[PDB]
Design an enzyme around this catalytic site. Sequence first.
Site, PDB file in Angstrom:
ATOM      1  CG  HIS A   1      -0.340  -0.209   2.540  1.00 28.35           C
ATOM      2  ND1 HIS A   1      -1.081  -0.265   3.705  1.00 28.35           N
ATOM      3  CD2 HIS A   1       0.948  -0.419   2.905  1.00 28.35           C
ATOM      4  CE1 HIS A   1      -0.277  -0.501   4.727  1.00 28.35           C
ATOM      5  NE2 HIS A   1       0.960  -0.597   4.270  1.00 28.35           N
TER       6      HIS A   1
ATOM      7  CB  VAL B   1      -6.826   4.910  11.370  1.00 29.69           C
ATOM      8  CG1 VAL B   1      -5.964   5.631  10.341  1.00 29.69           C
ATOM      9  CG2 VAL B   1      -7.529   3.712  10.778  1.00 29.69           C
TER      10      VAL B   1
ATOM     11  CB  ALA C   1      -4.389   8.572   7.102  1.00 28.56           C
TER      12      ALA C   1
HETATM   13  N1  LIG Z   1      -3.560   1.269   3.366  1.00 32.44           N
HETATM   14  C1  LIG Z   1      -4.991   0.845   3.484  1.00 32.44           C
HETATM   15  C2  LIG Z   1      -5.936   2.010   3.133  1.00 32.44           C
HETATM   16  C3  LIG Z   1      -6.005   3.056   4.200  1.00 32.44           C
HETATM   17  C4  LIG Z   1      -5.139   4.147   4.180  1.00 32.44           C
HETATM   18  C5  LIG Z   1      -5.128   5.069   5.225  1.00 32.44           C
HETATM   19  C6  LIG Z   1      -5.999   4.901   6.305  1.00 32.44           C
HETATM   20  C7  LIG Z   1      -6.876   3.811   6.328  1.00 32.44           C
HETATM   21  C8  LIG Z   1      -6.876   2.901   5.280  1.00 32.44           C
HETATM   22  C9  LIG Z   1      -5.340  -0.359   2.614  1.00 32.44           C
HETATM   23  O1  LIG Z   1      -4.425  -0.909   1.948  1.00 32.44           O
HETATM   24  O2  LIG Z   1      -6.542  -0.728   2.614  1.00 32.44           O
END
Ligand SMILES: N[C@@H](Cc1ccccc1)C(=O)O
Lengths: 157, 785, 266, 233
Positions: free
Chosen positions: D61, D144, D197
């Site tokens: 991600h 989060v 975020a």
């Molecule tokens: N990185 C998370 C997405 C996300 C980003 C930031 C805050 C919350 C969720 C995902 O791969 O689903």
Amino acid sequence: IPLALPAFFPAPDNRGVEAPYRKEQRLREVLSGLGFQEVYTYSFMDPEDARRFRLDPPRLLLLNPLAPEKAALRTHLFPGLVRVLKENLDLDRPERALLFEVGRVFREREETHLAGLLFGEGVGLPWAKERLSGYFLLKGYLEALFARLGLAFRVEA
Amino acid sequence: MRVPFSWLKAYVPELESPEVLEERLAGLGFETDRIERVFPIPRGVVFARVLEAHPIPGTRLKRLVLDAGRTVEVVSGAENARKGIGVALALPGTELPGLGQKVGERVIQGVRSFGMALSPRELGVGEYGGGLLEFPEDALPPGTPLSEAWPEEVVLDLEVTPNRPDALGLLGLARDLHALGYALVEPEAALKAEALPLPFALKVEDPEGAPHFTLGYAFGLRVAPSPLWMQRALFAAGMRPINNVVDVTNYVMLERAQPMHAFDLRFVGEGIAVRRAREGERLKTLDGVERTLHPEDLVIAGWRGEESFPLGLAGVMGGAESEVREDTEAIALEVACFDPVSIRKTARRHGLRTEASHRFERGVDPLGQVPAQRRALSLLQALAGARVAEALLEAGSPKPPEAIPFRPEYANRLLGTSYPEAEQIAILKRLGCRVEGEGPTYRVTPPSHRLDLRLEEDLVEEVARIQGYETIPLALPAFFPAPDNRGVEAPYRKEQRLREVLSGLGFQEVYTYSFMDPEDARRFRLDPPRLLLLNPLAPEKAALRTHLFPGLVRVLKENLDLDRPERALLFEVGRVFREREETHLAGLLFGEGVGLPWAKERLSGYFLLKGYLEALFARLGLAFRVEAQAFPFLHPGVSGRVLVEGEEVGFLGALHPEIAQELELPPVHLFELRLPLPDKPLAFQDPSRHPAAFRDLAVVVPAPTPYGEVEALVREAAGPYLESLALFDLYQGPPLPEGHKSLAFHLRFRHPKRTLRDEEVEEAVSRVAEALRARGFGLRGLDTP
Amino acid sequence: RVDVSLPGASLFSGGLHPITLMERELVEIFRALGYQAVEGPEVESEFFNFDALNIPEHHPARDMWDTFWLTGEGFRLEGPLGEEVEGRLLLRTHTSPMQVRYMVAHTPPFRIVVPGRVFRFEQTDATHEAVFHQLEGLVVGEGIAMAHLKGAIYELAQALFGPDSKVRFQPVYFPFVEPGAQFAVWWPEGGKWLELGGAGMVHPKVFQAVDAYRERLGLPPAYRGVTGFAFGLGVERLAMLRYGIPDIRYFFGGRLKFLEQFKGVL
Amino acid sequence: GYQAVEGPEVESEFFNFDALNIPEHHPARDMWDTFWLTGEGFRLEGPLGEEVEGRLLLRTHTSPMQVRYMVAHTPPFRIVVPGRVFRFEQTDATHEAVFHQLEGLVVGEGIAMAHLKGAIYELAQALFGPDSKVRFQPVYFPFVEPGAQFAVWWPEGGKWLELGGAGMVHPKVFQAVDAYRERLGLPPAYRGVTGFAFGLGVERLAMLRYGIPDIRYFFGGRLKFLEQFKGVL
Ligand SMILES: N[C@@H](Cc1ccccc1)C(=O)O
Ligand SMILES: COc1ccc(C[C@H](N)C(=O)N[C@H]2[C@@H](O)[C@H](n3cnc4c(N(C)C)ncnc43)O[C@@H]2CO)cc1
Ligand SMILES: N[C@@H](Cc1ccccc1)C(=O)O
């Protein structure tokens, strides 16, 4: 007086109001990259050129022009371009040139125009001889522009 | 997990309907992927009592004499068919969800089968069709339509995130709904215990693996089928009923996220020992699978004298032997809390995923064992006539959870809400938290079942979800960004414009995988890829691409096979890997070329692509030029490196003919550069008005000599007044010094202020004519009329 | 031998005019702050150019703009809602009339920035033109204060000249704002205070003209309980200081040797 | 007010997982099917150009960029980080091992969830018109808390589209950030701030918006396919 920044959700009808302006700007950028060189010419025109360039007389005139040469409001965009091509050929001697200009034209109603100009030997190998020039060269470029804009293009007689 | 509406409704009696339940759960943080109505049972299926089972001689079938109101006979080949149980009788005429062809009277091996007894699969309640449904013999009055005691049910497929292991138990879900305001009904584990010693001991040899371990003792067991209500409940949750004891352990597991296992004492010996497994130890799990244990596997074992043996794979699955059956009279009830990581590894190691491992991997209420024992034993007492010892065997003593500091003011600040303090505190209590203090900062200690509640933030989310995320207002922040955030978007913008200029210029953007075939390092003749995948999608994508052009040549190929592009001008920007991750720009040219389609002449190959690139850079306002240099993957004849602002950044040229051959492709031209490109400041050059000088002259040079040297030589010598300098013609031939060529050069001189006199030019031009010879070249271009 | 360092096909390379570049950067800066760009017509009526902006005729204040008046029938000037409008035609002497056109056609709150060619009867020299460009700014809505105008310009300066940049505001007069003000920015490299434009809190009479035209058109009032700030800055002056251009006449000159010099800055 | 910055595709376990409160052997680390890498000679640089260590991988991600940025800058700010991401999965009609995400990160004093909801609301309006609306539901993310998934109402399709996840930056993320900072000589910069975020998938959105049926085309390479977007520039 302090410094601050405002925060608010814009009223609904202000949504996408920048679309038009953005649309034209991209057109300039595509053109700019495609090869066309942007030019800016005065909105004024010489009433005489209506005769010279063989065009219908300008509809709006200046009750207080800067000079008789700039006494009317340009009706077309190309005339100004041909003029700059000339004065360009006198100060420097461009062996060719692919220009374009976007501007407000006046006639019955104010409207936005896009004009381009081609001239010179053409395109190809400088040390060689063959050349891609004239009408079809310019028509080629335009075909490209529209292929890039994703719009149907064609020129009838 | 599957969530049977009417089962959940037993803890939350006020639930509106499956639909309102899906909404409630969605707002609580549990999404349902599907809502399903499940037990349609026709009028034709009635409850029957098996008065006797007579084997039909010469066959492996039985003639069942059933009491279904009136006595009826049915033929069955099910091995569990026997006297003394209740069964699901589909009377002649019944339409069953499966067969599609009605059930009827039929003659089988000499006997008139009046309908047939059903398996879970035939009735449509479960996937199992290896035997008949087994009910309590007195479950209902013979002949009673089964539906009257087995209504259809609605089941929700709930997504239960890793942070809510407590939600892996229906009562857990019920707690959340209770927090919303629904009345909660907790089952009362009523026990009539007896004070006596447990006929076995407990020895937890591995406290890390089993931080808390309890054993309950139930005897005087009357093993039989579970009540219809429990079988319906279990079937809706995706589990198959076995018998009352086993079913009770599965029902409680599903009720409160607490796996448990009844071990038949016959096989326990003097006691149970929770210990690591001795390498080589065998164990036949209840799934019939014969396994061999690893020394890292936590095991539930028993011992007899100097003998120690595995009874079950701890927290994953019990053994086949000690598993409870009809002749079982007494058991040791295992209710524990195992080490997640340990169960995690074991489960993977043996390729097992069970309702038990799943829960232990996600976590179990560290202090829920004792209450869980009570529930199970209570049920065992009610459904199996069990006698239960008041004492439990217990090892381990988990400490209750600590208090979390909580400030209603911070909750509202973090959320941007304005929930009155009293509502916040009450929400936390509904969820079972202890709340102490007077404020503004309280002391909130969570229930042991909530492993996810440790920080003040976790607690604010509790308030948010219960008040409802929809009650959080919408707003936009206003602030002057800290100074070092200024222009941080420059890099990203720079590359984006490059793509757009390219896109307009004529290049078509392509996106190719970052993966590369290790083999291509050989094929395309490149240094081997530095980074590899310890777990690639396939050997073809086992390495990280080192170049960009290879992928482009490949797409050109597969493009020529699906459609037959007569040409193509592509480009791609991407991350390449080698010693360091870097951004690359690559382009590809191929085909007839450019010109009039109906005509013949064409502008193609190398110089066409070099033209475009010259344009790109004229447009980017950067110095461009390509000098000679060979590259394994290019053509020694059509190959050179690229110079941007007098700095090498990549290459340009025709693909290697040989390379084109192994891949069966026409001549392909291309280039690859390293981004970001150099940046040249604007030193605005005011153009002089005075006219400029016009002069021509060719240069004679050997066939080898690069146009480069000449241009540079001529230029550097031209003087500080040389304006233009272009090449307009090449000859090389008769009547020139065989092995030489001529370069037509248009020149121009200009001066900032004053104009230029024929003397300054005729004199400065000389400074170039003789330096042109000092190098070994002449000026064929002389005296032009 | 296949000389690879030989000139390739002479494909044309385009470019954008310096004012287009400057205008773009200015629009990018304000877009990041929530402003949307809309354009207006070059031929305006006295009503939008002057009267709606509290600049009456025979007004000593109307002399701050040397107007180019026009003549000729057949021309149909449309208003904010496409409706044909009347009044003595002229070349807008600033972009400000667009503030009015927009407000009658939309509802607060909003943020706009309107770039555009403007005209004034003047003698064209080294630092003066009869035909140049301006960029208007208009932000309206409840509780919008001058603290926000100062905040806007402050961000403009930072984005334009770096962190060592600063802005200064001084009272000045404009019939369409009150309080009125001129603002200057600190350009570190040049170590000089550059005067960029004027601004202020939209004048009470502007909102009234807007809502009056609205009712006269059937729309309901939309500006009685809001305030706002507006600003206008010259494009050439800024483009010059930023691209190091000595003569403002070049912009409209047409010299390729001149325009070509900005192919780099795109 | 958001500014776009990119991050590296090859990351260390530290930025991709540990700094984002996703420890190893964590049942939560299974929400991302990781592509692990091998090979010496490769030099991965940190937020301040410094060489960093740890098991290399392909970011699962864009989130690790949240951490890289925060250690290299100071609040308050607004960033959006687009980028190619990788996950070990079977590529079909609506699934890919190689796709794109767009992160969002806004940090500063008094930054609340009301602002996250405001952000997504503006996203929806801009994307689907005034008849558009967003819905937020609790969901889990180690980085989060509160956590949330958000969906938007697409009028034409009359369906609720699930776009991405989001939440208030987790307390442990800020700590990891400032810890790495001190370990690097910089002073703490995130003790008295909060932030939100979000992350949304690009393909899913591009598909619904350009009416594309198969997600595999994006990387396919068919000109007959790519050429179809010359119009939309
Ligand atoms: N990185 C998370 C997405 C996300 C980003 C930031 C805050 C919350 C969720 C995902 O791969 O689903
Ligand atoms: C080792 O420690 C454990 C094991 C299992 C559990 C889970 C659950 N309480 C429970 O019902 N425990 C166990 C078992 O009681 C039940 N079961 C299901 N089917 C059988 C069976 N046959 C089909 C022949 N024979 C014996 N037992 C059976 O399946 C569950 C899965 O193991 C908890 C702790
Ligand atoms: N229109 C004004 C500039 C300005 C705009 C808006 C508010 C204040 C001043 C001018 O021509 O100088």
